[PDB]
Design an enzyme around this catalytic site. Structure first.
Site, mmCIF file in Angstrom:
data_model
loop_
_atom_site.group_PDB
_atom_site.id
_atom_site.type_symbol
_atom_site.label_atom_id
_atom_site.label_comp_id
_atom_site.label_asym_id
_atom_site.label_seq_id
_atom_site.Cartn_x
_atom_site.Cartn_y
_atom_site.Cartn_z
ATOM 1 C CD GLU A 35 34.857 38.830 37.384
ATOM 2 O OE1 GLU A 35 34.226 39.690 38.047
ATOM 3 O OE2 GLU A 35 35.774 38.144 37.883
ATOM 4 C CG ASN A 46 35.606 46.519 45.257
ATOM 5 O OD1 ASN A 46 34.861 45.564 45.440
ATOM 6 N ND2 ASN A 46 36.207 46.741 44.088
ATOM 7 C CG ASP A 49 40.287 48.164 47.571
ATOM 8 O OD1 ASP A 49 39.085 48.147 47.217
ATOM 9 O OD2 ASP A 49 41.222 47.811 46.819
ATOM 10 C CB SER A 51 39.621 49.658 44.153
ATOM 11 O OG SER A 51 39.012 48.455 44.574
ATOM 12 C CG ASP A 53 35.833 45.230 40.773
ATOM 13 O OD1 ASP A 53 37.072 45.230 40.884
ATOM 14 O OD2 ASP A 53 35.071 44.816 41.665
ATOM 15 C CG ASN A 60 40.330 46.688 41.649
ATOM 16 O OD1 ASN A 60 41.342 47.165 42.159
ATOM 17 N ND2 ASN A 60 39.112 46.854 42.169
#
Length: 130
Positions: A35, A46, A49, A51, A53, A60
């Site tokens: 990750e 992202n 959408d 959003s 991370d 998220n």
């Protein structure tokens, strides 16, 4: 902050991750590696959408933490996403525990399914004293 392999393994064990909800320490290490590469300041936007991370586990904003800029998002970890960018990973671990308490468990993260599920993860905890 960028953690060293075994340093992190012990950090996680001290925080109660070893076997938490059936998830071995090796699996948590594999997740953190894929990750963020063990980096606490890692972030990923992202654009689709809207959003982001955050942190070592790349948690998220749409469902887990609040950053105030993700449209229609919720905050199931009840933490500002800023808490997921600290050098001290206690808060990030509390939230990762909240995530795995959901229906999918460790499978919540696609990266785990890709790089950890059905694979040999022993290498991550070898010689760490955990």
């Amino acid at each position: 902050k960028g953690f060293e392999r075994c340093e992190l393994a012990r950090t996680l064990k001290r925080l109660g991750m070893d076997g938490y909800r059936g998830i071995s320490l090796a699996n948590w290490m594999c997740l953190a590696k894929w990750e963020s590469g063990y980096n606490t300041r890692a972030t990923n936007y992202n654009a689709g959408d809207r959003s982001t991370d955050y942190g070592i586990f790349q948690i998220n904003s749409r469902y887990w933490c609040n950053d105030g800029k993700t449209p229609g998002a919720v905050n199931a970890c009840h933490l500002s996403c800023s808490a997921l960018l600290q050098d001290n990973i206690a808060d990030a671990v509390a939230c990762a525990k909240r995530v795995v308490r959901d229906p999918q468990g460790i499978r919540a993260w696609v990266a785990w399914r890709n790089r950890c599920q059905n694979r040999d993860v022993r290498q991550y905890v070898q010689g760490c004293g955990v």
